[PDB]
Amino acid sequence: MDLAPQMLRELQETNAALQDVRELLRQQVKEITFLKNTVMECDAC
Amino acid sequence: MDLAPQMLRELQETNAALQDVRELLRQQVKEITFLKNTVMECDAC
Amino acid sequence: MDLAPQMLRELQETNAALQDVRELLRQQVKEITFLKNTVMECDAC
Amino acid sequence: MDLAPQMLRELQETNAALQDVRELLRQQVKEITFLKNTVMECDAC
Amino acid sequence: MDLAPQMLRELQETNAALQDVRELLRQQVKEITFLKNTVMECDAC
Ligand SMILES: CCCCCCCCCCCCCC(=O)O
């Protein structure tokens, strides 16, 4: 129906891109939390 | 009418992921801030 | 019934969450820049 | 009532917010990269 | 005035910027990971 089909595909791609960003961020948070504890447990500090 | 139901669904899933990203970012800045504070008080520095 | 009003609401909710994300990120960069400068002045280094 | 005009405005606001998010992420990655290298050449390591 | 064409262009712009955000995030996670590992093999601690 006109551009509706095209718009729906764009929305689907956005949702897919979002899922990946979500996974990346969840991975980044773990690394950051790890870094935090590591420096937090540094003897020289 | 039209692909309205389909489009709405994609928007709903996107918002669900976006709300998750916001909370993830919320937690991350908190960890980063604690990491910053720890380094600021690091005697080695 | 008509789903247009509901679609508009979803879009409005997206922008609200996206705005919070922009604000958090803005703060995070500031925190990361502070962390960087602190490390640059860390004597042990 | 045609909600297309209002929907368009929301989509436009979304892109404006995304542009700010991308610009912020660009500067953030630069700060983190600089932090990485600074720790790499840190004497006490 | 039909706004569908313009709305489609907005959706495409959203996916373009999001892909940029994703590319930057995956690079950043790599930089953060490098930072994490460098701190782990840092003698000072
Ligand atoms: C309608 C599309 C939804 C908007 C997409 C949201 C993009 C947010 C990316 C978050 C960036 C994370 C930055 C960070 O803390 O490292």
Author numbering:
A (entry chain D), B (entry chain E), C (entry chain A), D (entry chain B), E (entry chain C): 27 to 71
Which text from the study accompanies this structure?
Cartilage oligomerization matrix protein (COMP) is a non-collagenous glycoprotein of the thrombospondin family that is found in cartilage, tendons, and ligaments. It is a homopentamer consisting of five subunits held together by interchain disulfide bridges in the N-terminal coiled-coil domain (COMPcc) composed of residues 27–72. The COMPcc chain fragment forms a parallel left-handed coiled-coil with an average length of 70 Å and an average outer diameter of about 30 Å. The axial pore of the pentamer is divided by the hydrophilic Gln54 ring system into two hydrophobic cavities that are exclusively lined with aliphatic side chains.
